[PDB]
Amino acid sequence: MVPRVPQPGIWCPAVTFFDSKTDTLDLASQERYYAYLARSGLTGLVILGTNAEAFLLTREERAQLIATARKAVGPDFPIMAGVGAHSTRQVLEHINDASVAGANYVLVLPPAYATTPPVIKSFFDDVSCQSPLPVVIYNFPGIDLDSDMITTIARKNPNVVGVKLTCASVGKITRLAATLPPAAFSVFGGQSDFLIGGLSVGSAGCIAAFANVFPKTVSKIYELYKAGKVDQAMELHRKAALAESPCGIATTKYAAAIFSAKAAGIEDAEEKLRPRKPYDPPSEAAKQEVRKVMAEVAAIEAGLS
Ligand SMILES: [Ca+2]
Ligand SMILES: [Cl-]
Ligand SMILES: [Cl-]
Ligand SMILES: [Cl-]
Fold it and tell me: Which of 57, 170, 220, 284 has the maximum number of C-beta atoms within 10 A of its C-beta?
């Protein structure tokens, strides 16, 4: 069974497939893709993160994706669902939808419509208390939450079980560790390129966009660190950080289309991984860059899977 407090490890915030002719979710492809990712050494999936274009989805689509995730991975693989919105009412509706659809945890943005600090504090208090699922603070700056607010929120709310920091520092991680024991609270960095130092000071690890593209490689990096084989870990980490260069959403979707989605046997992956209307796909030149810059890590991934 999935623990109350999210397991340290490597998590992937999965991209979203759209049938472009009808502008609807492509759930058959989505299920194939989620299942492939969960079978590539990942600790868990983040569904409806920012990479999934969650804010472009209807409430019903959000719930279908969570349910599709659960079906793809089975009952023993952790799912963290993004639920962020503008009001407490919307957040609670998303949370309850997530709970019914099978999520284990909910990942919650602070309210943004730049809000004040007692507003942030009372929001998280109200949300943790009402939420049927354990809560991970989603810090994506839009306001930025320092160590003081996070610790305050966590100490008052035992249903708060972690934080995703998007731009995590070694200082920030350390401060959190010193005040919040790991058994009750998991810190996640959002950067694969942070994870070298990220884990060396006791993060719970990482929620990495790039694990969409080469999940086995990103998991190998983590696995080598936990084995103490720190020499080859850093050498592989280096290569992977190099390949991660291209960054936002449209480029990531396209990389997944030509690497992981193809590996998952999804046909026409490139059309299905266009950004949702009316947003445009990457330029030809952006696409050429992806293929050149990621070719080496692709060969490594074909070697590990
Ligand atoms: Ca192979
Ligand atoms: Cl399905
Ligand atoms: Cl194919
Ligand atoms: Cl492969």
Answer: 220
